[PDB]
Model the fold of this input.
Amino acid sequence: PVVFPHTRARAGGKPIMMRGKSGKWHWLGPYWKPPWAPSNKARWPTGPEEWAWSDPTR
Amino acid sequence: KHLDHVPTERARQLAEQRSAFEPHLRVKLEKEKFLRDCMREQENLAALFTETEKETLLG
Amino acid sequence: EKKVTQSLQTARVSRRKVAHVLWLKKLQDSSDFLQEQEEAARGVAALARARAKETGEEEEELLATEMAKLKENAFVNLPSRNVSVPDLLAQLGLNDEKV
Amino acid sequence: FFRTDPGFIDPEDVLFAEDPVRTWSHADGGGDLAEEVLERSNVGMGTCILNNASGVLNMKGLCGLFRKLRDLEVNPLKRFVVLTSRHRHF
Amino acid sequence: MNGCSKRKSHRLLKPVFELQQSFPKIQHWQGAEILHRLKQKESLEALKLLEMFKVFNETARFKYPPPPVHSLVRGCAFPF
Amino acid sequence: MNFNRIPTRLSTHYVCDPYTTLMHYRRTFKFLQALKAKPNCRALCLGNKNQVNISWPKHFDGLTVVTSAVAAQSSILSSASVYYSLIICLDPVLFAKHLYRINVPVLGVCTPREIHEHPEILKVIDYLLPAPCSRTDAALRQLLQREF
Amino acid sequence: VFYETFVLFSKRVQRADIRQLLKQQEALITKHHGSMLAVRDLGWRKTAFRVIKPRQGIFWFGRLFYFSFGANPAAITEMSQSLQSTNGVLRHATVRMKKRHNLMTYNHHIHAR
Amino acid sequence: DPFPTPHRVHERFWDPSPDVRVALKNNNVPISWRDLHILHHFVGENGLILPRRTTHASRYQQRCIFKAICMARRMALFPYDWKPTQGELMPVMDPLQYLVDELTSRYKATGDLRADAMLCVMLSKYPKLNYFRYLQYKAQTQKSEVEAMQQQEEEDRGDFSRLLRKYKR
Amino acid sequence: KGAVHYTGTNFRRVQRLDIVDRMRALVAQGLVDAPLWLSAAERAPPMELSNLKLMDRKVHNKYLSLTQAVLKKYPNMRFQDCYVDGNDWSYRADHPVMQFVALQLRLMNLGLDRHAAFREAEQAFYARRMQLEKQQKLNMAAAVVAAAARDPSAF
Amino acid sequence: MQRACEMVVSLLRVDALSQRCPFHVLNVQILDLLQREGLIRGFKVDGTKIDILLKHYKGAPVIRNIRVVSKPSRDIWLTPHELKFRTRFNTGLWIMQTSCGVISHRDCLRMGIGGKMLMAINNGY
Amino acid sequence: SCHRHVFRAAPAAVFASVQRWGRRNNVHKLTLLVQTYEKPCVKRTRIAEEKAYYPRWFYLRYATEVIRYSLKHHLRLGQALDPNDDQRLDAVKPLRLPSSEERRQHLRHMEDVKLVLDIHSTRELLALEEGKHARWGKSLSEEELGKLFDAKRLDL
Amino acid sequence: APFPRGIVKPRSAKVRAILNLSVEQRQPNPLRAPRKSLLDPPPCVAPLEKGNPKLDRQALRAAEKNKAKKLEQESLRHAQELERFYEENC
RNA sequence: UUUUUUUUUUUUUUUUUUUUUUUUUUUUUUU
RNA sequence: UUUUUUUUUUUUUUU
RNA sequence: UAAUACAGGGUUGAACUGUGGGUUAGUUUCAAUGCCCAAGGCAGAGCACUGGAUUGGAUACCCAGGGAACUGUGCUCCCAUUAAUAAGAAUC
RNA sequence: AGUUCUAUUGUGUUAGCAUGGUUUCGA
Done:
């Protein structure tokens, strides 16, 4: 089968932080991955370390 | 659209492999031969072996 | 071909649910109060029925009366006597040198 | 280990391996590579690759081969024509 | 008769002058002030030594001098 | 030790391919054979100061001394197309701005490392010659001229 | 779902009080369609710094207790407020019961190796 | 006189100390507020939280560690401006369990005789306790009994048992 | 405004002409006389170099991922050739680590799978240790024993 | 129609050997006409994308200028007698989309049928 | 909080340690900020600027260390690394023991107490190996210990 | 690290060189711009010296250049000394 | 105004994510 | 006397 | 911004679906600070205001007091208007 | 692209708690 990718546009908007002395987010927080970001494999080539946990089921 | 018949790369690769009864992809490395330059470099030396055109440089 | 994948999906979820049952079984075994309250409950049940057959009274009053008392006397076998002081224990184990 | 040893292999040499058959991936019009005869537009040279399922040279292959050979030979720009094949060990 | 076959030439054994770390180029005027502060906490100065490694950035009033061309030509003439 | 970034993509060099060297020498030999037949032919061997293994003379014909004032890319070897007929440059990277519009054949001998990083040298060089081991031209040509 | 609570008693707490406290708690559990799991004790614990609680005094140590239960999620607020009013209890916290990390199934080979 | 190594390094290169590396894994168990004997390493003299460039830990576990230490302080189970003491280095568990566990390691490293005796008595006294490690070690002493069979057959020139084991190739 | 044409005048398209072509025009135009070496290069024009660099391609380095598994199972490879320059452990072609992985990639080209290559490579190198290295060492050691002329009883 | 105009960006490159292109039915037919004139060395459909080679001569590429006439938002049509005036005293290549397939501008005038100017190759002003 | 004890040390030396302790914890910086009220807008720009200057200082500090380290040792690194360079031992005297094939040749060009010391020393070795003096000194030949002695009779 | 309450979005190159870590000019993108080369024409700039142009064709500062071009150059000689003939050709 | 001690009231960003590490992957011809 | 300022004053404590 | 309750977003695994989309009024939520109204109070700060300085001729700069303004389900978007100066597709 | 299930949570709301600068008190 042959299928083409879909549009990268999605609902919502970009993260925005409220102004003033009261620091608070408006739509999204810091942990937001844009639709045009690269693959996770290339961003973290090192991967889990030897002393890392092999079960993140906290 | 998923049922469309378009000639892709993997589609043709599988067709050739199916013909071989239970003949796979193979690659070839560059051919490095020492006689290509070993037996030819000496000829070029004759064009400059004269003492009046070699000693001045490598003196 | 879609029907073939239906059988595979059922097997996949079945294995996942099997592991879940094992976790709950551990809790039951590990739980002391659960067993203790359960055990007590059963005993009273038979005594009320047996006593009623002799005197001839109704089982509603006997059962009711006994039920109430079990909850009041539930915390009687606690705390398992754990008077051990870690601070003191460690000192004798060559692990603490403060007094 | 030493570079002068008999059983010495350069890791870089084996890293740049390529398939000679894949070199002829591009051809003339038609994305699906199924024509009995192929041609590549070159400057002063005429390319002709004989690609077939089992190298069977039937009447279909001859009809195309004759046309390409005559078309390139008549052209004065193409001073010579090269011929080759595409099958593996055939 | 079981000693090493290859000579010892590792950098760790023999200290040398080098920089085992990369950083983006910095403006000459920005780094000049920082270097002066370190020297205050008490041969050629350190400012010139770092310039040979191409550490600073090409600012308006600072450009890398070109290589020596007029004092580096050495040719030989011979018949052929 | 090294604390810098480790590269991932390995670029290939086709200009200095082992097979390409076969045609490079064959084509170059034909040009030199025909030139030496003619009478009164002179060549030029341009090198670098770091090349201690190659002896150099005191004076150099065609050398022009200029000053910093009004020197917008002055051509040093401007008059080197009268007495000479063949220049063999050993450092095309350094001698790149002067040989841009030279009226003589340039037999440059560069290395794959410089060719890939500085492809501009391909336009000035007419006849490309390979360089085995590609380390130092001073000791490279000596071995070729002293074979066997 | 399952829940956990760690209660730190004082020196001024007798066995009489402990039984009473637990009995009261069980009332709420049953109210909200729940059931007690198990009750255990941890003994005494040393405090890093002095505890100054108003209208209670100053203490340097206490008895640490642990008990597991399960009820409706809305029962956490009722339980939390009851502990604060009662005397003896100087500090307490409620921690949700996890699948892997727990004081029931995972209690061995912590400090050793 | 080793070469001066820069303190600021990319995250790709890191060489945590062996002592702290083993404590991070915690036998593939996430660190929680109960692990009091492990949080004492991730704290300075003033009691402040160390950065990710000092403890040398991953991004996921860095946030979890901060939560465990923060909660322990609220419970009056951790200092606020100094390091813990020797009397507070113990996880949140059964006091009796600590003793048993402790003793098992000594019997396995050097083989303390006193430790063995203690456990023996405790076995019966506290049947409701975990003895998996203690039982496994004793059950593994069968190598001494089987060695007798090898010696007994040695009198009859029975060396075939040794050659077969060595004939691995 | 300014260099806003990705596909246009930004990318120059100037023809590349060699000395043979440039000299042919000047002589015909009558600007410069024909030199004595003009005909020498006419019969053997230089080889084109612009089209040769187009074949250059970048390939992925498979040794970065393959070498990780080799050291994990046999981490005793870094000890060999440690004091030599070029080797880092915070490798040269001659290093054992590079030799072992080289055979694995070569074997996979024939058609063998990734896992199958590991078994073949392990056995291929094992023989060299027992059939050549072990034999050589033992042979030499034997001769040492024969050197008993120092003993008074030897004669 | 939108994918047709996206081929000029990829094919108009100097320092490159092969460039990808989205797969389309109309795009395949266009490449056939260009290859006949000797402008494209070759092309291959690699599934979801088409790999098209680039032709070079003495450094500079064979293609130096590309003009898009037709656009998805409108449609340019010229009568047989009007195309000659537009295209005169030039060596350019105009792609004409007639009812009987796709042909160049030279063939459109021969038949005398009303085509459609799609794009221009090697065209000046 | 920081506490130090003076033991066999001058007060001046001890006082120099506590002074640097505040710099790590920014005790002085925080004390002055709270004294005066700072507008939130100023902190927005000041917090960002400190994230670009401090990182640059660390890189420059390491560079100065190399200059001082190299000054006391001289030397300098250059582009000396080259793959095409076999790092072989120079002069390389130590070699495998002779296989008896070359031992005989050595005596052929050294026959001529100084230079005649080898006479009667190495000669007895050859005779002993062949089994001329002692019946137990006979050794084995190199051609009868590898064909059917190690490739088939291996212990493994 | 500190918890920023916002972010700065400068537009001029004056302040952009302070807030940002660096303003070094990276390699131009080949897909948008050509690769820079030394063969390009030089910029049209007249020579100036303290405001007085020089358009005619006819000690501390000097010491600094000698300390870097002489002392450093001698070190490179020793590197090649033991590679050319004295050790490379036995 | 300094030091010390023992429980009133308002308020809640000090510590805790980072060498900007994809073909470096992007900012505007000229002076 | 204390507080404060480049300097000073106003203000506050009273055996 | 440790604990707990309600409900979103992002990353990965399986199943399903088999062109579902880009932009967006005669449209609809949210939106720093200031002002009207309302609720309010017992801390830390301060505009107006006679409260201790000016000049080489004029002042709010440097202290202290000081009843507006500082938590809103509301009225409500004037600005240097909240994460660059393009909401999408193609060339790595 | 979207729905279901599973792992993950300094993103919105949230009444009591712990700690702390200032302030307040003196059997």
Q: What stands out?
A: Residues 11 and 57 of chain K are 32 Å apart (CA to CA).
